[PDB]
Amino acid sequence: DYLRYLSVVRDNVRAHAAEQRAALEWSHPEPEVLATIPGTRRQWERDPRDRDFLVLRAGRHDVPLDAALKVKDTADEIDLEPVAHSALRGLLDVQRTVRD
Amino acid sequence: MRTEEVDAERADYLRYLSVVRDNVRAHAAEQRAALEWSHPEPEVLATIPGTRRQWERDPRDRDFLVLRAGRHDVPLDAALKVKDTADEIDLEPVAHSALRGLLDVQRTVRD
Amino acid sequence: DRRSFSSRTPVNENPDGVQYRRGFVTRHQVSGWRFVMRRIASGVALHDTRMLVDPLRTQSRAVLTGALILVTGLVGCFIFS
Amino acid sequence: VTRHQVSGWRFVMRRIASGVALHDTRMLVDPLRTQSRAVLTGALILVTGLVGCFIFSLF
Amino acid sequence: IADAAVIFSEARRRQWGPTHIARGAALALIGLILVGTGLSVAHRVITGDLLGQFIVSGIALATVIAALAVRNRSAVLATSLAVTALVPVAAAFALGVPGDAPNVLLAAAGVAAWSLISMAGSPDDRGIAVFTATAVTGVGVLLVAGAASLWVISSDVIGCALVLLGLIVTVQAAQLSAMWARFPLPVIPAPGDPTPAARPLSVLADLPRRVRVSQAHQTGVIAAGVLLGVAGSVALVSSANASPWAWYIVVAAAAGAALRARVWDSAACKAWLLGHSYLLAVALLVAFVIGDRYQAALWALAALAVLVLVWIVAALNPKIASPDTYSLPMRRMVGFLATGLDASLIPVMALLVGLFSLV
Amino acid sequence: PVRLSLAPIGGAPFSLDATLDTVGVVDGDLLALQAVPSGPPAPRIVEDIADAAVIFSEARRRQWGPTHIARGAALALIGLILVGTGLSVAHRVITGDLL
Amino acid sequence: SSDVIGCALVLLGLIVTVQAAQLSAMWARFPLPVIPAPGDPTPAARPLSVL
Amino acid sequence: LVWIVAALNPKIASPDTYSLPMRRMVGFLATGLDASLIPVMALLVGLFSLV
Numbered sequence: 001d002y003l004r005y006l007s008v009v010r011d012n013v014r015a016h017a018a019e020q021r022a023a024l025e026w027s028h029p030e031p032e033v034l035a036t037i038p039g040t041r042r043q044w045e046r047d048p049r050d051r052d053f054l055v056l057r058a059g060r061h062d063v064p065l066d067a068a069l070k071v072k073d074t075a076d077e078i079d080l081e082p083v084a085h086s087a088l089r090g091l092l093d094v095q096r097t098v099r100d
Numbered sequence: 101m102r103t104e105e106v107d108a109e110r111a112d113y114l115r116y117l118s119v120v121r122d123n124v125r126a127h128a129a130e131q132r133a134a135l136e137w138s139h140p141e142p143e144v145l146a147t148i149p150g151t152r153r154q155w156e157r158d159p160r161d162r163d164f165l166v167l168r169a170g171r172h173d174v175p176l177d178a179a180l181k182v183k184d185t186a187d188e189i190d191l192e193p194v195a196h197s198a199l200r201g202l203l204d205v206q207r208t209v210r211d
Numbered sequence: 212d213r214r215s216f217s218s219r220t221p222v223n224e225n226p227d228g229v230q231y232r233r234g235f236v237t238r239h240q241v242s243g244w245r246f247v248m249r250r251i252a253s254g255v256a257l258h259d260t261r262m263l264v265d266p267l268r269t270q271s272r273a274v275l276t277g278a279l280i281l282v283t284g285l286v287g288c289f290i291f292s
Numbered sequence: 293v294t295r296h297q298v299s300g301w302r303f304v305m306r307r308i309a310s311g312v313a314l315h316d317t318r319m320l321v322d323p324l325r326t327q328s329r330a331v332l333t334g335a336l337i338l339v340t341g342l343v344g345c346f347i348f349s350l351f
Numbered sequence: 352i353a354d355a356a357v358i359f360s361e362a363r364r365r366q367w368g369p370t371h372i373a374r375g376a377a378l379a380l381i382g383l384i385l386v387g388t389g390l391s392v393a394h395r396v397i398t399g400d401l402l403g404q405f406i407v408s409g410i411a412l413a414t415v416i417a418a419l420a421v422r423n424r425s426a427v428l429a430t431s432l433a434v435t436a437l438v439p440v441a442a443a444f445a446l447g448v449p450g451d452a453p454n455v456l457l458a459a460a461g462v463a464a465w466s467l468i469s470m471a472g473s474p475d476d477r478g479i480a481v482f483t484a485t486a487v488t489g490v491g492v493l494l495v496a497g498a499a500s501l502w503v504i505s506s507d508v509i510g511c512a513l514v515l516l517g518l519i520v521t522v523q524a525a526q527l528s529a530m531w532a533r534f535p536l537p538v539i540p541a542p543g544d545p546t547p548a549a550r551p552l553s554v555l556a557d558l559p560r561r562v563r564v565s566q567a568h569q570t571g572v573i574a575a576g577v578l579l580g581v582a583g584s585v586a587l588v589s590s591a592n593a594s595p596w597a598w599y600i601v602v603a604a605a606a607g608a609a610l611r612a613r614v615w616d617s618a619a620c621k622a623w624l625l626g627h628s629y630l631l632a633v634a635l636l637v638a639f640v641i642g643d644r645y646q647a648a649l650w651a652l653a654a655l656a657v658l659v660l661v662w663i664v665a666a667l668n669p670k671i672a673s674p675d676t677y678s679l680p681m682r683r684m685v686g687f688l689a690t691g692l693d694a695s696l697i698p699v700m701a702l703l704v705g706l707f708s709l710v
Numbered sequence: 711p712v713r714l715s716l717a718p719i720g721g722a723p724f725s726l727d728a729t730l731d732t733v734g735v736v737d738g739d740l741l742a743l744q745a746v747p748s749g750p751p752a753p754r755i756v757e758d759i760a761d762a763a764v765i766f767s768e769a770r771r772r773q774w775g776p777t778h779i780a781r782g783a784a785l786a787l788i789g790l791i792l793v794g795t796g797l798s799v800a801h802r803v804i805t806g807d808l809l
Numbered sequence: 810s811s812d813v814i815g816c817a818l819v820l821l822g823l824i825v826t827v828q829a830a831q832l833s834a835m836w837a838r839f840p841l842p843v844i845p846a847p848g849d850p851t852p853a854a855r856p857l858s859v860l
Numbered sequence: 861l862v863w864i865v866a867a868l869n870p871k872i873a874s875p876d877t878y879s880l881p882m883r884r885m886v887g888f889l890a891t892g893l894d895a896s897l898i899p900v901m902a903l904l905v906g907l908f909s910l911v
Contacts, residue, residue: 036711091757359742
């Protein structure tokens with residue numbers, strides 16, 4: 001049951017990371033696409049009201065996933081289940097960093 | 101109730117008390133380290149007046165005008181409190197003996 | 212009820228807890244390994260890892276009850292002679 | 293004494309045995325009781341086969 | 352223009368060149384090694400001196416060193432030669448023993464050793480079912496021929512142990528594949544504090560190769576289970592008028608291999624499980640013909656006709672091959688039947704082998 | 711959109727730093743506008759080996775379906791026909807019979 | 810006979826080797842536990858000269 | 861030979877590099893051997909040859 005719940009929250013975290021990389025690939029294309037930009041209707045597009053303004057692409061690395069991913073661990077060091085907590089520790093360390 | 105279940109319970113409680121014993125011994129070593137730093141033996145303090153640490157005791161300190169005479173059982177200024185909600189004492193007879201042993205021996209620092 | 216005591220291990224803050232050096236396997240570790248290897252073998256064969264009903268354990272326990280019926284038939288036909 | 297005092301005495305003696313030999317005090321798994329009960333179940337298999345071939349003689 | 356793909360199908364559809372020449376030479380070498388096994392096996396069996404074993408062993412040694420030497424360059428001709436290399440190895444380590452079976456032990460050992468030393472140093476696929484199926488088949492035939500060659504066997508224990516090995520390999524299939532894939536094993540800690548390190552990104556990025564290797568190994572393990580569960584199913588019952596317990600073992604192992612195809616979900620393993628009845632009918636037919644019966648061999652062809660008829664009516668009537676239209680009591684009862692078949696196989700194994708007639 | 715480039719038919723599209731004579735263009739060749747082949751889109755990383763087995767093995771077309779059963783029935787029929795011919799011809803030539 | 814001095818010797822070796830932790834815990838005279846009854850004793854504390 | 865292959869191959873001689881039921885089965889075997897050591901003593905001494 002707990003690993004089914006962990007698969008559900010892994011699906012949700014992967015959806016958050018997919019939306020974040022989709023926004024970051026809309027707002028910072030690879031430095032070959034932007035020769036086709038200045039003809040169409042998207043050249044002078046970044047207003048100072050939009051959350052990307054005077055922010056420049058240097059490359060691709062591990063953006064740290066601006067979603068929270070906070071467990072509500074409230075117990076006073078009660079020892080956890082050795083396969084559920086291992087899977088949660090495996091989820092909170094390789095899904096909390098988006099790839100390149 | 102099987103005796104195997106209370107044996108595993110006794111083992112888990114004694115492992116918890118072993119970790120609390122290690123932490124209390126760390127507290128006692130820190131308290132003795134502070135007391136030996138601020139009150140060294142009467143053969144080391146020949147080297148004190150030369151260095152940059154001779155007249156170091158100021159009237160804002162917790163060890164100021166405290167003249168070191170000797171060493172005996174300093175009482176471990178941390179608490180060692182048990183949250184004794186287990187009223188009507190019929191506790192586990194080995195798991196109760198080790199708590200009294202730790203609360204009686206380790207509550208005082210040695211020399 | 213009886214106010215039991217769950218398994219606890221606090222942080223150490225002391226140079227003894229880094230010195231265990233022993234590998235001894237509990238009942239919980241071997242049961243967790245049984246669960247992981249029954250989730251992987253129900254994850255490369257059944258291709259769904261929800262582990263509601265595991266059919267591989269059903270088949271393997273079926274052939275194990277076959278071998279157990281063999282052993283009980285042997286101990287039943289040995290005491291006949 | 294009660295039964296629980298006897299179980300406590302057996303448990304502290306087994307924990308001392310696990311202390312001086314395993315060099316740990318956790319007592320999660322105790323192989324020393326496994327060895328002792330292994331030899332004792334060998335003795336139980338011996339005495340069970342012995343009374344089994346004794347009551348075999350009353351056939 | 353309107354169909355620009357057929358212009359891009361005139362750059363792919365290349366002419367003769369050196370492209371087809373390498374394929375033709377590879378097929379030429381495959382045919383050379385196959386006919387060089389076959390001719391000299393016929394020479395060593397029918398009439399001939401040590402030249403018959405000599406050509407087979409030379410072909411085997413040259414084929415093993417060619418399949419182990421060309422691995423760094425081609426890696427497709429290499430695995431093709433390593434697939435075809437286990438017919439002359441299984442002929443040279445079978446004829447080379449003097450005598451006759453006392454020689455199928457070395458044949459099983461040779462095909463198992465060559466399968467295991469071609470499977471280890473491999474990329475992701477092409478260490479597919481053809482290698483690990485022959486590996487588990489050679490291990491099972493080795494473990495039966497061990498008891499067959501050193502001790503005495505009444506030629507019913509052979510099929511008994513072969514059907515038992517096929518059932519053990521087929522039932523405990525995915526656990527054996529997950530162990531053989533060398534997965535990144537879990538890190539279940541002790542309830543003290545020996546907190547293990549996290550898995551590095553190198554062993555995590557490699558994982559979709561290991562999943563394909565696990566799928567190939569489980570397809571091969573199921574195929575070896577079917578091959579071993581038909582290689583002893585054909586020896587229990589085709590010798591001379593076996594008991595109805597042998598008939599029940601053959602029919603029960605076939606029905607268990609048919610009912611285990613509702614559990615797996617890879618399509619190739621489902622086909623290998625459903626084809627056990629077909630391979631059973633063909634093997635029993637070719638064992639009744641070579642066993643000189645011709646009166647139940649026509650019955651074997653009739654049973655194969657019933658098998659292809661149920662395949663045909665499952666094909667063009669898609670309401671018998673759909674487990675949604677069936678009932679939950681029907682699925683429950685056929686699951687109980689599928690458990691009962693391999694639960695009742697091993698008591699019938701003990702009844703037929705003679706283990707209630709020793710005591 | 712995506713930056714296009716000229717390409718010879720059946721080959722990688724031309725790198726934009728190269729010219730039409732450094733890479734070889736003949737007068738009269740057929741050149742097609744193809745997209746730049748830039749690279750792979752961030753392969754997935756999952757650490758739950760059960761989820762890594764259900765997710766990464768979907769490139770299998772592994773659905774059983776009422777379309778593999780047709781190929782099975784056709785191959786089973788051809789196998790029946792060939793093995794019936796083989797059985798009966800071997801029975802006719804190894805005996806003398808009219809069945 | 811023979812094979813009864815060897816059997817008794819191997820059995821003595823196994824009995825001594827398996828029970829080699831409790832026996833060495835009694836050889837050195839370890840300070841035995843003082844586990845109280847559940848009714849009403851007081852658990853005594855060990856003196857600071859044996860520890 | 862097994863001592864030497866344990867010496868200069870320092871991964872076989874460290875049970876952290878093994879698997880959780882493999883060393884559990886090692887514990888099963890090491891329970892079973894000195895469990896069975898006493899009835900084979902009874903067979904060899906002929907303790908079942910008097911009753």
